[PDB]
Amino acid sequence: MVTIRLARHGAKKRPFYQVVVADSRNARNGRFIERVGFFNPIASEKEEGTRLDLDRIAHWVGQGATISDRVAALIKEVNKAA
Template sequence: MVTIRLSRGGAKKRPFYNIVVADSRNARNGRFIERVGFFNPLARGQEEALRLDMDRVQHWLSNGAATSDRVAKLIKDATKAA
């Protein structure tokens, strides 16, 4: 099953997440199909906290991709902000 989920990057105590489309059997930070955005939970000031390519997210959702709980909330927040 294809899922849209977070892939962790950044340094210790400084998380940064890529929002990726990946096969659910692959490791969290393993191989992915497409990167559709990023999420920076520690964004300060003018730094961008969330960026999503909504066209690609809608494409994958229409093709049956599932979302993780956190990504579903981020998508909801992004559509509300836009």
């Protein structure tokens, strides 16, 4: 089962999450097909915070890939008309 989920990169106490399309069995940090945007929880109100390429999501979710708890909410955060 393919799944869109965070990878957890960056330093100690200073995380940075590479949202990525990977297989269920493979590890968090490990194997994947293609990365699709990112997320930063320690960004705050500035120029950049979160980016998520919605065109590639249609290729995977449209076919048959689940979205994890955190990535499903970032699709709500980025919005359709807000």
